[PDB]
Write a protein that binds this ligand. Structure first.
Ligand code: 1QN
Length: 265
């Protein structure tokens, strides 16, 4: 199917917040792309608002390039460069187990992605593994951050901060606290409040950070304690948090070579 004079629409990949994702080809450039579709007539149009956020974020490391934006038939269309699998897909492919080196390589980039979004006056509000994608080819070592559908100028229950479960307005600290649960999720293979059948808020609040992080380097606990200590309007010390993991990376004797667990398959 023809899209905006130069794109050929392929099949559905998955779904984002407020729209389905499809494979595509940029016919003029000879490159595969990813296409997000939104019904023109939806009660709450958001595709064009999100495109403006991506546009403002352009130039930042690990911010995907948006190639075209417009309307075609029954849909609002956004075209993005093709990226690789999400960290959730890669975690599942690695049998839900990442080495400490992989977790630390990912933490370094992920803290930087969040800091960049915050430097652009936005909070993401949905920090989770499926919102981080690895690049392809020459950009294969790069962690990209996606989905600005829930973003706000200053989510998922499993990774929500305690302040979020309390019903408090999300701020910079909440994006970082979510990353801290994402990091522990990669370390454990699961979180203690996962698969409960409300109950998540109670389980999170009754699980001390020292119990959550037991058997893992103290840095994961120190990271979460720092995020929980941040005030609503506080500018987080991103450099301190990256240095916490960097010092542990050096103590372990690891090389910053971008060779992740999946690269060894
Ligand atoms: C997973 N690799 C294919 C892939 C998927 C995506 C992708 C995923 N999700 C949940 N959303 C998007 C997306 C695609 C286009 C767009 F305009 C806005 C967002 C992106 C690139 N490459």
């Amino acid at each position: 199917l023809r899209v905006g004079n130069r794109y050929r629409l392929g099949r559905k990949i998955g779904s984002g917040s407020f729209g389905d994702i499809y494979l595509g080809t940029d016919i003029a450039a000879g490159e595969e792309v990813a296409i997000k579709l939104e019904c023109v007539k939806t009660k709450h149009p958001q595709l064009h608002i999100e495109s403006k956020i991506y546009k403002m974020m352009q130039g930042g490391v690990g911010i995907p390039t948006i190639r075209w934006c417009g309307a075609e038939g029954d849909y609002n269309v956004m075209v993005m460069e093709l990226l690789g699998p999400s960290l959730e897909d890669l975690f599942n492919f690695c049998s839900r187990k990442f080495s400490l080196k992989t977790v630390l390589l990912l933490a370094d980039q992920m803290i930087s992605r969040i800091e960049y979004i915050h430097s652009k006056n936005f909070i993401h509000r949905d920090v989770k593994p499926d919102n981080f994608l690895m690049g392809l080819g020459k950009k294969g070592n790069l962690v990209y951050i996606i989905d600005f559908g829930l973003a706000k100028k200053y989510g998922t229950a499993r990774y929500a901060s305690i302040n979020t479960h309390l019903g408090i307005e999300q701020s910079r600290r909440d994006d970082l606290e979510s990353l801290g649960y994402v990091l522990m999720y990669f370390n454990l293979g699961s979180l203690p409040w996962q698969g409960l059948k409300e109950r998540i808020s109670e389980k999170k609040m009754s699980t001390p950070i020292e119990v959550l992080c037991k058997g893992y380097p103290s840095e994961f606990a120190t990271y979460l304690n720092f995020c929980r200590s941040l005030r609503f309007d506080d500018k987080p010390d991103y450099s301190y948090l990256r240095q916490l993991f960097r010092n542990l990376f050096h103590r372990q004797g690891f090389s910053y070579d971008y060779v992740f667990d999946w690269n060894m398959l």
